[PDB]
Amino acid sequence: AQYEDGKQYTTLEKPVAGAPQVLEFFSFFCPHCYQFEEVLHISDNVKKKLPEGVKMTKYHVNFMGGDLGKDLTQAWAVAMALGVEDKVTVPLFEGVQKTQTIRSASDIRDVFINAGIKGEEYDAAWNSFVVKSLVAQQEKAAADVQLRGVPAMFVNGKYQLNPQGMDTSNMDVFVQQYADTVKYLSEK
Ligand SMILES: O=C(O)Cc1coc2cc(Nc3ccccc3)ccc12
């Protein structure tokens, strides 16, 4: 076959019921996740190849960066609750990995302030129980698949993308093969 279990993707032998259709996991500490966002635009390219209006979800993970890693999971929960993911993704990646100006929860907050989120708006969300539940949701989804590596994408809680079996000599071909594989897996 052209797509084979163990090549472009792997199959969870403990499938996850009720999981989002397309679920991505990342960390602002994760170097390939940086490339996935700024260089390859994996998420948008996958969306362009999926049918109209299918749900794509993207969650942060705790297991990179220790204490700040957990702060970033809470900040991503804030970003999801306010709907400002498109405004803070790039400055958070660059603040952590390029300029290395993100060293504390206060530095994370500064990114939101600079992006136009009001201070009282950010603090109220940060301490809200809705965000507490969003943090729990992100942790549970990662736990459901015993996730230990990022970037990761799962399709229908059953298939895990395997980018290690994709040619990386051409970045555009890589993204296309990745997106086409997600489309193929979604149609199973
Ligand atoms: O090797 C791995 O663990 C799999 C993997 C995960 O995310 C990646 C991102 C890239 N980025 C890239 C850079 C230049 C050309 C093509 C791709 C490459 C491999 C991976």
From Swiss-Prot:
<keyword id="KW-1015">Disulfide bond</keyword>
<dbReference type="InterPro" id="IPR017937">
    <property type="entry name" value="Thioredoxin_CS"/>
</dbReference>
<feature type="disulfide bond" description="Redox-active">
    <location>
        <begin position="30"/>
        <end position="33"/>
    </location>
</feature>
<dbReference type="InterPro" id="IPR001853">
    <property type="entry name" value="DSBA-like_thioredoxin_dom"/>
</dbReference>
<protein>
    <recommendedName>
        <fullName>Thiol:disulfide interchange protein DsbA</fullName>
    </recommendedName>
</protein>
<dbReference type="InterPro" id="IPR036249">
    <property type="entry name" value="Thioredoxin-like_sf"/>
</dbReference>
<dbReference type="GO" id="GO:0003756">
    <property type="term" value="F:protein disulfide isomerase activity"/>
</dbReference>
<dbReference type="GO" id="GO:0071236">
    <property type="term" value="P:cellular response to antibiotic"/>
</dbReference>
<dbReference type="InterPro" id="IPR013766">
    <property type="entry name" value="Thioredoxin_domain"/>
</dbReference>
<comment type="similarity">
    <text>Belongs to the thioredoxin family. DsbA subfamily.</text>
</comment>
<dbReference type="GO" id="GO:0030288">
    <property type="term" value="C:outer membrane-bounded periplasmic space"/>
</dbReference>
<dbReference type="InterPro" id="IPR023205">
    <property type="entry name" value="DsbA/DsbL"/>
</dbReference>
<keyword id="KW-0732">Signal</keyword>
<keyword id="KW-0574">Periplasm</keyword>
<dbReference type="GO" id="GO:0015035">
    <property type="term" value="F:protein-disulfide reductase activity"/>
</dbReference>
<comment type="function">
    <text>Required for disulfide bond formation in some periplasmic proteins such as PhoA or OmpA. Acts by transferring its disulfide bond to other proteins and is reduced in the process. DsbA is reoxidized by DsbB. Required for pilus biogenesis. PhoP-regulated transcription is redox-sensitive, being activated when the periplasm becomes more reducing (deletion of dsbA/dsbB, treatment with dithiothreitol). MgrB acts between DsbA/DsbB and PhoP/PhoQ in this pathway.</text>
</comment>
<dbReference type="InterPro" id="IPR050824">
    <property type="entry name" value="Thiol_disulfide_DsbA"/>
</dbReference>
<feature type="domain" description="Thioredoxin">
    <location>
        <begin position="1"/>
        <end position="131"/>
    </location>
</feature>
<dbReference type="Pfam" id="PF01323">
    <property type="entry name" value="DSBA"/>
</dbReference>
<keyword id="KW-0676">Redox-active center</keyword>
